Amino acid sequence: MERYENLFAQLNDRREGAFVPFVTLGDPGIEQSLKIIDTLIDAGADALELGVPFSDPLADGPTIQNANLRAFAAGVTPAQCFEMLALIREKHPTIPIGLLMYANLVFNNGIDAFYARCEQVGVDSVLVADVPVEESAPFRQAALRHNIAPIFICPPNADDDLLRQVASYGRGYTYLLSRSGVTGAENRGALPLHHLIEKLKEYHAAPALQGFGISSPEQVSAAVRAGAAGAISGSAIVKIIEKNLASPKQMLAELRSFVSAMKAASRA
Amino acid sequence: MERYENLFAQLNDRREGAFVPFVTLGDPGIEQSLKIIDTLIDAGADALELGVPFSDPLADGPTIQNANLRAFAAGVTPAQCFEMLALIREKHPTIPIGLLMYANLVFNNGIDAFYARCEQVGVDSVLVADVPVEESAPFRQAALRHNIAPIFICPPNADDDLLRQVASYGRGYTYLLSRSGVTGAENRGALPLHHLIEKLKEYHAAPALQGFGISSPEQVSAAVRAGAAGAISGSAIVKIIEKNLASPKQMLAELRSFVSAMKAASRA
Amino acid sequence: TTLLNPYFGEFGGMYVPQILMPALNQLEEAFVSAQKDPEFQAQFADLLKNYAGRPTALTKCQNITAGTRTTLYLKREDLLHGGAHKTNQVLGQALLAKRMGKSEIIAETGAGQHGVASALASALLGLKCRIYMGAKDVERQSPNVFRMRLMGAEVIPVHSGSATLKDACNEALRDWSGSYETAHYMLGTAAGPHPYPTIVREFQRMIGEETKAQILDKEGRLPDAVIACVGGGSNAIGMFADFINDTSVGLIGVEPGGHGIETGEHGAPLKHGRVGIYFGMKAPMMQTADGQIEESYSISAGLDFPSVGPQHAYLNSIGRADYVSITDDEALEAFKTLCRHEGIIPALESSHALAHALKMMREQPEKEQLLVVNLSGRGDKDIFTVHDILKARG
Amino acid sequence: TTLLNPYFGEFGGMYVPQILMPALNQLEEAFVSAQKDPEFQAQFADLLKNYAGRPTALTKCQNITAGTRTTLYLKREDLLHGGAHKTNQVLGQALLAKRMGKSEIIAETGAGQHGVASALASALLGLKCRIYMGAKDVERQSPNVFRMRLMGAEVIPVHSGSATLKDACNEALRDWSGSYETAHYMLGTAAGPHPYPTIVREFQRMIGEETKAQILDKEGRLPDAVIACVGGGSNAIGMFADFINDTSVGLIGVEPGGHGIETGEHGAPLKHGRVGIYFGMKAPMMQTADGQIEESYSISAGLDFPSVGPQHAYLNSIGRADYVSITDDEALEAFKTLCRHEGIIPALESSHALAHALKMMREQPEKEQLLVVNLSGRGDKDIFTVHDILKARG
Ligand SMILES: O=C(O)C[C@H](NC(=O)Cc1c[nH]c2ccccc12)C(=O)O
Ligand SMILES: O=C(O)C[C@H](NC(=O)Cc1c[nH]c2ccccc12)C(=O)O
Ligand SMILES: *Cc1c(COP(=O)(O)O)cnc(C)c1O
Ligand SMILES: *Cc1c(COP(=O)(O)O)cnc(C)c1O
Ligand code: NA
Ligand code: NA
Predict the structure, then answer these.
(1) % helix / strand / coil in chain D, to the nearest 5?
(2) Nearest Cβ partner of C174 from A58, A109, A152?
(3) Radius of gyration of chain C (CA)
(4) How far is CA C225 from the centre of its chain?
(5) What is the number of other CB atoms lying within 10 angstroms of the CB of residue C154?
(6) Which class for B234: exposed (0-12), middle (13-18), buried (19 or more C-beta within 10 A)?
(7) CB distance C278–A103 less than 8 Å?
(8) Residues C59 and C76: beta-carbon distance below 8 Å
(9) D77 with C68: CB under 8 angstroms?
C-alpha cells in the first residue's frame, strides 16, 4: 500500500510534521495495550511504531527493557502481537504502522514468512534494530516483495557512503538517530542534524523521522524546523505507562495529554 | 650414688627380677600423683620411671599423651616436678628413680644445669627419648659429671655396633625395647629378645629392663626367664589412672592390686 | 565492506545496530594491522611467556589409560596464569585496545572467569575495566566477583531478562553502543559479531600450535584426535586451528549435555539447538519455538553461553569437526577420575572433554589411539559443587 | 655415622628416638645414590617439566616500581601445578620413596598445602598416602581436606596437644616409628632431622637455579637481593641455594611478624625465638620459658611451623643471609597492591616477602636496586580471609 507516502503528502499539504509514538505491544497486557494504542491515535498520533516483545533487546535502555518485561509477564507472544496488529488495522485503515523488531524474531521461522505475515495483517514497515545495512539484503528484499517498507537507522555521524545506502535501501521513512547509545527518554541529542537531513533529501531518501531522547514538544518543533518530516517518541510514552500501572484510567489520560501536546508542536 | 647397682645386687641375691612402673608426674594432679607414687612403692615397685609433662611427646602413644594432657590441665610444670621428686626422695632413700624426658626440657636452660638439678633432688637416671646414641655425647657427659646414669634404648633389631655403643654409653640399666612404634599397653612384642640380652651381657652393658607393651604378670616372668633383669610397665599403669579419675580411692586400690601382681611375677 | 570475511559458510556476520558498525570496522582494521606488526607480536609473546607462563605443559596420563591402547595427553591450560585458557586472548585484546588508543575495557561474564581474566589483563596493562554480570550469576560467583574487585575492576550486576550471561552480553553491547570512542569491548568467547570470532581464535591458536610441536616431540606424529569442551568455542577453536589443515586429525568438540539431551535441560545448541540471529551473529542458539533466547544448562557454570561460535557451526556443517555432548554425571565422573589417578583437579568445563576421551577409550579399549584433551582450566573453583553433589549421594 | 654432615654449624642434627635412626640412614643413603643416578635425575626433571610445568616464569613488575629506582621481578612458583612451590620437592621425595621400594607415604600438614601436594604426588606415582593434620586445622581448611580426599589420600585428624601443625608433626613421627619398613615420611619443609633439610633444599634448588638464569638473561647481572618468606624454610632455601656462593647477592628471609613482634603473637622464631630441640633438630623454636613448644601466629595459615630450618639459622649466624619480619597488616597491604597493580593474587605467605621488597623500595625510592621476590604460591585460597578482614573495615 502507500500509507506512509499518503501520510507525508497530507502533512506536507498542511506544512505539518509527523508525530509518531512508540509502545511495546502487549504492555502491560493485551487489552490495556489495545486501549493505549487507540488513545494514542485519538490524541493525534500520525503513525505508530510498535515493538514485539523480545527476550534480549540489546538496543534498548531500561525503560523499554521494562516494557518488554511487563509484556512477557502478561504472556505476550509474537503470534498474539500479530493478532493485535490485525485488530488495530481493522479499526484504523490509513494510519501507517511500523514494527520495531529484533532480527531473531524475523529470521526465526523464515524471513520471507515474517514479511508475508506483516503484509497479511496490514503493517506498513519494519525496522530490525540489529540488522545494519551491511546485513540487510535478505530483509529489504523480502520486505519489498511483500509491500513492506524496510526502515534503516541513520546514525548522526553517518558517512557519505552510509547516507547513500540508507537513501537507496530504505522506504517509508528514514529513522534519523539523535545520538549514539540505546533508546531512552532522558538523554537529549547534542548533534546538529541539518546536514544529514539535507544530504538525505539530496539522495531522495525516505522522509526523516528523528528518534532517541524525543521527550518534549519543543523537540518536535525543532526537528521539523531542522528539515525532518517528524519525530518519534517512545521511551517518554512508555514511562507514562510505567508510572500509571496502578491506574489504567489515569494512564490513558496522561498518555492523551502527552500525545496531544507533542502532536500540537508539529502543526504549522 | 649407686642406687641401681645396689638394687640389682639385692635382687640377684634373691634370684628376683625388677618390676618398675612408670607414671607421669602430676597426673592427674600433684597431690594425687604423690599418693599414686607412694602406693606404687608400697605395693612392691623396685624402682620408678617418672615422666615430666612435655607439650609434644613424639615417642608416646595415646595413653601417655593423655597423661601429659591431664598433668598440663593441672598446671604441672617442670619446676613443680622437681619439687615432687625432692619430696619423693625424702620419703624413700634407696629406691632408684629414673626420669623419662624429651630433649627440649633437658637442653632448655642448659644440659649441665638440668643434670645438676637431677642430682640435687636425688634422681638416679635420665632417659631422653629423642636423643639417639649418635647425638648423646653432651647428655651422657653431663649425666656422668653429676652422678646420673644416662639410659639408652636398645631397639630389638639393634645391630652389633649399636649394641656395643649402648653397652659402652649407658649406665644403671639398659632399656630393652620390645618392639618398634611408640609407648602403648595393648601391642605386645613379637620379638625373641634372648639374643640382644646375651650380647648386652657380653659387652657388660647395664642390666636390661624390658619395656613397651608390658601389661601382664606373665610378661614380667617371661622377661626374667629370657635373661632380662626386669621389666617396666607404664601405659598399663597409666590406664588405671585414666579409668579411675572419678574415684581416687578406687584408683589407688587398682594400682595397688596391679603392681602387686606384676611384682609377684618377678620373684623366684 | 570489511577486510576479512565475516562469515564461516552461512554462519557469523555482523548483526549489530548500525551505530556499532564503525566500532567493528575499526577493531578489524586494528587487528589486521597488529597481526602484521612485529612489535605487537613480540609484545604479546612476551606477556604470554613471562606473565602468563606459556608455553603450557602437555602431560601424558598413563595411569588413566593403563590396560588400554589409548595414549592420552592433556594440554595444561589449567597451569596458565588465572587458571584457564581465557588469559591468552584477553592479553591480546588488551593490547589491541591500547593500539587503538582506548583506555577503558567493557567485558561480560557468566561464571566469572572471563571477568577475572579481563580484570587481570586490565590491571597489568593500565586499562579501566568494567564488567557486566547477570545478578543471578553475581550471587553464585561471590569469589570471582571479589577477585575482580581486588584487581580494580568495576563489577555491574545486570537484573534484566534472566539475569545471567546473555543479559550481561546485551548490557555490554548497550554500553558499547554509547562509549565505543573510549572503550573497547573485550568479548569473552569466539562468538559475537565479526571480527570477534576471528580475533579470539587467533589469540588462542597458540594452544594448538604448542600442542602440535609438543606431540611431535614426544610421539613423532600428530594426534588421532584433539578434544575440547565447547561453551562459546574459544578454547576449542584455539586447540583446533592449527590442526584444521591436518586432515588426519579428528577435531572433537564437546557441548554440555546437562541432565541429558532428551530432557531439554542442556547446553548443546550446536547439535541440538536451531540457527538464529542474536549477539551479533547467525549461529545455532538455545531458543524457544517462537524465537526467544534461552539459557544453556550445565553442572558447569562456564559452559553457559547459549549459542556457539560460528566457526564451529561451519566446521561441523562441512564435517571437518565432530561435536558430541557429555552429561553432568559423565563430567563429574571424569573430574573424580582425573583427581584420583593423575593428581590434577580439572575445571568441570574441561571435564566434559576428558569424559568424552574416557568414553572413546573405554568403549573400544583395544583401539590404538593417540588423543589430546585440552584441559582448559583448573577445578579448584568446582570443589564445593562437586562436594555437595557427592554429599547428596554419600 | 652418616654420609653427609647433619649439621649447619650448631643447628640441625638427628634428634629422633633410636628406633627411627635406621629409617634416616636409609633415606640419606638412598638420596645420595639418587643424586648421582642419571636416570633418577631425568625422571624427576621430566615430572617437573611435563607434569608440574617447570620452568616457572620470572615476571617483571614495572607498575609496582614506577617512579622509583627499584626493578622487581617475581619468581612465579604460583604458576606451578598445585599453586605453590611445595610440588617440586614432594615429586622428588615420592621418587625417593619408590627408589627405596616403599609403597606408602605419611605426611603432616597445617594449612593443607603440603597435604594436597603430597596427595597429588602420591596419586600420580602410585603411592598410598595418609596425611596427619591437627583437628583445629582440619576445621579451618575444609577445601584442602576435600582436595586431599578427591586425590585418594587418607586424612587423619590429630586431637592431641594444640591440634595444629606441631601435633600433626608429632603424629607423623609416631606412625613412622612403627611403619618405616613400608612407609616413607614425606616431611613438608626444610626442617626436621637430617637428612630432610638437605633433601628438601636440593629438591627445591631449581627455583634459584632458574631465577639465576632468567635474571642473567633479562638484566645481564645477578640480583642485588632475593627475598622469600620463611614458614619452615623450603621456598626460601630453594631460592637462596644457588646464590649462596654469589657473595654480592643479598639473601633476605621474611618471617611472619603477626600482630607485631612486641605483642608476642607472631611466627618469627629465627629472630625472636630461642634455640631448642624438637622435631628431630636443634633450631630456634617458639617455646615457653620452661621449654614447652608453642604455636606460630600469622594471618597466613601456612607460615605456621613453630621453628625454622637449621640451614637458615646457620646462614643467619654467619651473616650470609638476613632475616626480618612483616606484620599481618603489611602482608595484607602487599596482597592488595599486587592484585591491583599486576593482576596477580599472591598467597598471603608470599605476600610477606613482597611486603618486605615494597618497604625496601618505598623506604629508599632513589636507591638503585634489582630485587627478586619468590612468589611461593597463589592466593586464590586467601580471598575469603582477606575479604572478611576488609569487611571488618569497609
Ligand atoms: O523516545 C524516542 O526518542 C524514540 C526512541 N524509541 C524508538 O524510536 C522506538 C524503539 C524501541 N526500540 C528501538 C531500537 C532501535 C530504534 C528504535 C527503537 C527512544 O525510546 O529513545
Ligand atoms: O608399659 C610399658 O611396656 C612401658 C612403656 N613406657 C615406658 O617405659 C615409659 C615411657 C614413657 N614414654 C616413653 C618414651 C620412650 C621410652 C619409654 C617411655 C609403655 O608405656 O609402653
Ligand atoms: C570459559 C571456559 C570455558 C568455556 O568457554 P570457551 O569459550 O568455549 O572456551 C571452558 N573451560 C574453562 C576452564 C573456561 O574457563
Ligand atoms: C608452605 C608454603 C610456604 C611456607 O613453607 P616454607 O617451607 O617456608 O616454604 C610459603 N608459601 C606458600 C605458598 C606455601 O604453600
Ligand atoms: Na554454548
Ligand atoms: Na617458622
Answers:
(1) 45, 20, 30
(2) A58
(3) 20
(4) 19
(5) 13
(6) buried
(7) yes
(8) yes
(9) no
- Tell me, what amino acid is at C326? I
| C-alpha cell, A205 | 531518501
Q: Name beta bridge partners: D250.
A: D225
- Burial state string for B102-121 with b = 16 or more CB within 10 A and e = fewer than 16: bbbbbbbeebeebbebbeeb
Contact at CB, A104 and C285, closer than 8 angstroms: yes
DSSP string, C237-294: HHHHGGGTT-TTSEEEEEEEEETBGGGTBS--HHHHSEEEEETEEEEEE-B-TTS-B-
Q: Strand, helix or coil at D268?
A: coil
* Catalytic annotation present for C85: yes
- Give the binding-site residues of ligand 4, using a 6 Å CB cut-off: D 84, 86, 113, 189, 229-236, 302-303, 347, 349-350, 376-377
Give yes or no for A170 touching C (CB within 8 A).
no
Angle at C219 (CA atoms; ends C214, C223), nearest 5 degrees? 75
Say whether C19 and A153 touch across the interface (CB within 8 A): yes
Number of domains, chain A? 1
Q: Ligand 3: which atom is nearest the Cα of residue C234?
A: 7
Residue to probe by mutation, ligand 4, list D204, D207, D376, D381, most atoms within 8 Å of CB: D376
The answer to whether D280 faces chain B, any CB pair under 8 Å, is: yes
Residues C53-78 as b or e (16 or more Cβ within 10 Å = b): bbbbbbbbbebbbeebebbbbbbbbb
Specify the ligand 3 atom closest to the Cα of C110. Answer: 1
- What is the distance between the alpha carbons of residues C266 and C280, in angstroms, rounded to a whole number? 23
For residue B221, the domain's CATH number is 3.20.20.70
> How distant is the Cα of B259 from the closest Cα of chain D, in angstroms?
28
Put simply, the answer to whether A109 touches C17 (Cβ < 8 Å) is no
Place of cell 584444521: C244
- For ligand 1, whether the C-beta of A46 sits within 6 Å is no
Chain C residues inside the 8 Å CB shell of D153:
none
- Specify the pairing of strand C11-15 against strand C280-285: antiparallel
Residues of D in contact with B103 (CB under 8 A): 15, 277-278
- C–D CB contacts, 8 A cutoff, strictly below: 105
Cβ–Cβ < 8 Å for A64, C277: no
Phi/psi of residue D120, nearest 5 degrees: -65, -40
What are D127's three cell numbers? 603411592
Backbone angles phi, psi at D278, to 5 degrees: -165, 160
The residue written with cell numbers 577493531 in the block is: C27
Instruction: Write out the residue range of the structural domain in which residue A200 sits.
Output: 1-268
Quickly list DSSP for C161-222.
TTSSHHHHHHHHHHHHHHHTTTEEE---SS-SSTTHHHHHHHTTTHHHHHHHHHHHHHHSS-
CA atoms within 13 A on the CB side of C72: 30
Q: Give the Å distance between the CA of D39 and the centre of ligand 2.
A: 44
> For ligand 4, atom 1, which residue shows the shortest CA distance?
D302
* Declared resolution, Å: 1.7
Query: B132–D166: do the CB atoms touch at under 8 Å?
Result: no
Which domains, and CATH codes, for chain D? 8-52+86-204 (3.40.50.1100), 53-85+205-390 (3.40.50.1100)
Active site residue B42: no
Q: How was this structure determined?
A: X-ray
Among positive and negative, which fits the CA dihedral D261, D263, D266, D272?
Answer: positive
Chains that touch D (3 or more CB pairs under 8 A): B, C
If you ran DSSP here, which 8-state letter would residue D57 be given?
Answer: P
End-to-end CA distance of chain D: 59
* Cell numbers at C162, concatenated: 534472566
- Left, alpha or beta for C260 (phi > 0: left; psi -120 to 50: alpha)? left
What whole-number distance in Å separates Cα of residue D340 and Cα of residue D177?
Answer: 48
